[PDB]
From Swiss-Prot:
One of its GO terms (cellular component) is host cell. The chain holds residues 93 to 338 of 339 of the full protein. It is found in: Secreted; Host cell; Membrane. Belongs to the peptidase C48 family. The active site is at H115, D132, C184. This is Deubiquitinase and deneddylase Dub2. It comes from Chlamydia trachomatis serovar L2 (strain ATCC VR-902B / DSM 19102 / 434/Bu). The keyword Repressor does not apply. It is a single-pass membrane protein. Its EC number is 3.4.22.-. The gene is cdu2. Effector proteins function to alter host cell physiology and promote bacterial survival in host tissues. This protease possesses deubiquitinating and deneddylating activities.
Length: 240
């Protein structure tokens, strides 16, 4: 499927930036997994905070290799929504295995037991939102809430205004991907698009119960979003 590969998720995050002008495109040269996502979310928001007080050096340090430092600073300056996608495969119990299996699936296409989930950090609402199209593929939802609540303390202090923690929302209130579908990527994009449209949406209201109707929603989302992404420069960062 088109939206299951990291590059096409990058291109989707570029598109949300060109549509909404407040989204930080994600950095696929720094793959996240359950091993390193919390740390990287933290580094990103500290970089954002430093840009706020005219400190450009930590920024040059964390700049994505395919993006110019000044352009990265500018995008951080205007972003209030930070999407992060975590890749996961329950076979791997090291980061080097996790990343080796990730490179394999992206190079060959074969999905296997791989899966994407979504974290959105929103500094306009001081909220962290989690979305898993299967609900508990990586961990139990309370285990994920716990991890995330701890990140929210970190973020409240990293990004003031005083240092109170961010709110944590679990957005995947119910399962949206049935068992034999390889659609998590697309579901993460569609959740993000709905979030940008209105950050107070309920997923249960968007998604039909009937399995054909649900599949049809996403299929329409995929075609239309694939069409908007065709006419692009390949893997270039947007400008401000």
């Amino acid at each position: 499927g088109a939206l299951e590969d990291n590059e096409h998720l990058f291109q989707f995050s570029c598109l949300m930036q060109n549509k909404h002008r407040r989204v930080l495109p994600i950095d696929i040269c720094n793959p996240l997994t359950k091993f390193n996502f919390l740390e990287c979310i933290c580094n990103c928001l500290m970089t954002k905070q430093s840009v706020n007080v005219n400190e450009t050096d930590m920024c040059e340090l964390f700049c994505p290799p395919t993006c110019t430092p000044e352009n990265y600073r500018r995008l951080l300056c205007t972003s209030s929504v930070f999407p992060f996608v975590m890749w996961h495969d329950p076979s791997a119990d090291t980061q080097e295995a996790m990343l080796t299996k990730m490179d394999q699936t992206m190079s060959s296409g074969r999905v296997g037991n791989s899966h994407w989930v979504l974290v959105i950090v929103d500094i306009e609402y001081r909220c962290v939102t989690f979305f898993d199209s299967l609900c508990d593929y990586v961990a139990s939802p309370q285990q994920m809430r716990e991890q995330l609540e701890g990140l929210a303390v970190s973020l409240g202090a990293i990004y003031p205004k005083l240092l109170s923690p961010f709110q944590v929302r679990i957005g995947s209130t119910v399962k949206v991907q049935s068992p034999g579908e390889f659609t998590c990527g697309a579901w993460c994009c569609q959740f993000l698009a709905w979030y940008l449209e209105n950050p107070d949406f309920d997923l249960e209201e968007k998604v039909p119960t009937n399995p054909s109707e649900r599949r049809a929603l996403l299929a329409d989302f995929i075609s239309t979003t694939e069409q908007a992404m065709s006419r692009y420069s390949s893997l270039s960062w947007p400008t401000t």
